[PDB]
Amino acid sequence: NSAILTIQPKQLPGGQNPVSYVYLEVVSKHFSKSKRMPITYDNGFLFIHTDKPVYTPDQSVKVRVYSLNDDLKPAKRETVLTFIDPEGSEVDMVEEIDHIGIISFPDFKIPSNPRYGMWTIKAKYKEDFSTTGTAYFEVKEYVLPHFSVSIEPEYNFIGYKNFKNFEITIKARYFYNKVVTEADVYITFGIREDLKDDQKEMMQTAMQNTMLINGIAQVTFDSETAVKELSYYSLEDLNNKYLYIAVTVIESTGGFSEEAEIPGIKYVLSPYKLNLVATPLFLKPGIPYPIKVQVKDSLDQLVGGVP
Amino acid sequence: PVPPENGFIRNEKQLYLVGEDVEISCLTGFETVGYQYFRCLPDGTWRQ
Amino acid sequence: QVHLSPDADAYSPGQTVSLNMATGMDSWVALAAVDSAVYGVQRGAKKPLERVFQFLEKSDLG
Amino acid sequence: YFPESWLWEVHLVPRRKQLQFALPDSLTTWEIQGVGISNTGICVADTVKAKVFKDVFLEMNIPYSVVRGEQIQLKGTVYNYRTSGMQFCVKMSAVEGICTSESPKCVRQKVEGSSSHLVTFTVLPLEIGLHNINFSLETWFGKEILVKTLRVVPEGVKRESYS
Amino acid sequence: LLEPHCFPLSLVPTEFCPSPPALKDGFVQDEGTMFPVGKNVVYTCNEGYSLIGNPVARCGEDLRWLVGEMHCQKIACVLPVLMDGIQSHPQKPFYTVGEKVTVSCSGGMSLEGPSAFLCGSSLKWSPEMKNARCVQKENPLTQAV
Ligand SMILES: *[C@@H]1O[C@H](CO)[C@@H](O[C@@H]2O[C@H](CO)[C@@H](O[C@@H]3O[C@H](CO)[C@@H](O)[C@H](O)[C@@H]3O)[C@H](O)[C@H]2NC(C)=O)[C@H](O)[C@H]1NC(C)=O
């Protein structure tokens, strides 16, 4: 059989500190035991939907939040919404009753000169619950792009298979789902010490132009030829480091000049690091036992066809 | 943080959280020109 | 499941159009709209409710 | 209209319900995401995609904000998805918080079929805040009005200060 | 009290609350023939309502429910006090969720503020104003000669 039970959220003796443990007891005709089961004020879910993932200054972040039990029924609990700066300080707490089973909030008009960066929404239930589902939005000075630009190689790394010739797609589409007809493209190549941060420079020669036509262009970096001519890294044995590739696309008769980047071209000694995928690490004699593994480039994507 | 010349930390802790703040001001002969708190940034600095 | 009931490849400036929200039970619904160019500026940004089923899976205690 | 987002709403639906709206002047895929809350769970719909797309239209590369008292280039374009090439024009008109050389009339240059053409307008934003600007295409067959909005900020070094 | 299962048990209860009180426009989310002392019930208000306060009833001491503060509110933006004799036109007893409402002064008067409010936040007007002008000086200097 099953009971459905709960800690009733108001009935905890509560106050300034939480009750961190509880007992679960059975009293049958034949047996009793307690056991110190934990409890958590992390109940149900909070999911936070922002009318954009990005904003400028002089906008209002118009959040709505979706509040649900672990039954995934809507919760109908009063809720308070903790806007956090990029600098980790709290900047607002605003409250609304979960009356629908969904919770709008007043727009939180961007404070008059904001700290740019990833602000955050620690949506807190008021009253008993700690659940603190959390979501993110970034204040940036911007105009919306005219077209999408994307970059696609097979490997996302430079190493033994390709250091002499690393080979990559530059592609672009209008946001009305049509290929960019013609665009001039510059490729920047720069050695980079890490994915985190540096101010390292570009290749002064063995930079590359390409043409984008019918939405696509191709690029081939002879990374040995550049590195051995311009750089310290003369041997393929030297590095677990990075190439910054950055792609500027200018529409060839259109005046819009979008740009994108991939820090994810590793110079690597051992590109194909591995993990198990679904393998429990427990056996069964007499039933054939699977294994599954996967392989990760740096700035990881699944590498595709590898022996 | 070590407070400035002739200075004194008002609220004393081992470890201040990110976004948490400390108040300072000069000793009995003296007065602060400027804003007399500092706040722990996410990288572990005080930007004094 | 949602569709614009004037089913078309393309529409035009100032055009009125109807949206219909076929739903298998009595339900609330919450519409939101964005220019795709909004995803073009924040590199690698997820959809604002992307993989709701995966976040909903983080509640698995195993 | 020219929005980044709109249609921010909540409703209760009988097993079908319908809502009607004017598609905005933003000529891009409006991608429309609908989230259903009821006793069985949450859902997010397979995102509907709709395209605001016309055979001929103008668009303008205007930056996010500009220095009061500095002149800059705004770069214009026509897109022409008609099967053939055609002569076109363009004009600009805005509030007196802007000044210009462009004296609002073209040489009437041609854009090819399935093709785009470049344009330039030179302006000095002269007052701050928001200026509404109309860019207008002044051409045969398919034609458009753009209304576009430009932020302006002061010419000097930013400092923050406290107490 | 420590080790109950060592003893006989009447594990079936013999002390009870009477059935919980009903509410206007809501119901007890639980149902049964009796509720034993210290068994809870929870309330839910019916379609188009949010239960304000605490929905949980105790079955506490003296066999009384100790229901606590609770109220069924119908989820409409019921209009607050207007501005300056400026009127909401699509009047209803309960403005429906997401219902776009349009607002104006009496004719010819120099009105101020936005034209509309939308109840998309279903208990608070999405934009709002607390005070705005209906009218102004509508007659300039004339015949300066
Ligand atoms: C730039 O384009 C805009 C369109 O956004 C032009 O605004 C338009 O201006 C006209 C005349 O001022 C408005 O006409 C109006 O007709 C209504 C009829 O009810 C009347 O009530 C108004 O008093 C007015 O006469 C039109 O609505 C308005 N369009 C909107 C919605 O903005 C603007 O004139 C052009 N700007 C330039 C370059 O001056």
Swiss-Prot record, chain A:
Protein name as catalogued: Complement C5 beta chain
Source domain of life: Eukaryota
Gene, per the UniProt record: C5
UniProtKB/Swiss-Prot annotation, chain B:
Disease involvement: Complement component 6 deficiency: A rare defect of the complement classical pathway associated with susceptibility to severe recurrent infections, predominantly by Neisseria gonorrhoeae or Neisseria meningitidis.
Coiled coil: none
Subcellular location: Secreted; Target cell membrane
PTM per Swiss-Prot/TrEMBL: All cysteine residues are assumed to be cross-linked to one another. Individual modules containing an even number of conserved cysteine residues are supposed to have disulfide linkages only within the same module.
Organism expressing this protein natively: Homo sapiens
Native organism taxonomy: Eukaryota, Metazoa, Chordata, Craniata, Vertebrata
Family affiliation: Belongs to the complement C6/C7/C8/C9 family.
Sushi domain mapped to chain residues: 1-48
Gene coding for it: C6
Subunit note: Component of the membrane attack complex (MAC), composed of complement C5b, C6, C7, C8A, C8B, C8G and multiple copies of the pore-forming subunit C9.
Record-given protein name: Complement component C6
Section covered of the full-length record: 647 to 694 of 934
UniProtKB/Swiss-Prot annotation, chain C:
Name this polypeptide is given: Complement C5 beta chain
Gene that encodes the chain: C5
UniProtKB/Swiss-Prot annotation, chain E:
S-S bridge residues: 17-59, 45-72, 77-119, 105-134
Cell compartment(s), UniProt: Secreted; Target cell membrane
Sites carrying sugar chains: 142
Domain Sushi positions: 15-74, 75-136
Record: disease: Complement component 7 deficiency: A rare defect of the complement classical pathway associated with susceptibility to severe recurrent infections, predominantly by Neisseria gonorrhoeae or Neisseria meningitidis.
Function, as annotated: Component of the membrane attack complex (MAC), a multiprotein complex activated by the complement cascade, which inserts into a target cell membrane and forms a pore, leading to target cell membrane rupture and cell lysis. The MAC is initiated by proteolytic cleavage of C5 into complement C5b in response to the classical, alternative, lectin and GZMK complement pathways. The complement pathways consist in a cascade of proteins that leads to phagocytosis and breakdown of pathogens and signaling that strengthens the adaptive immune system. C7 serves as a membrane anchor.
Subunit structure: Monomer or dimer; as a C5b-7 complex it can also form multimeric rosettes. Component of the membrane attack complex (MAC), composed of complement C5b, C6, C7, C8A, C8B, C8G and multiple copies of the pore-forming subunit C9.
Family: Belongs to the complement C6/C7/C8/C9 family.
Name recorded for this polypeptide: Complement component C7
Gene: C7
Residues of the full protein shown: 555 to 699 of 843
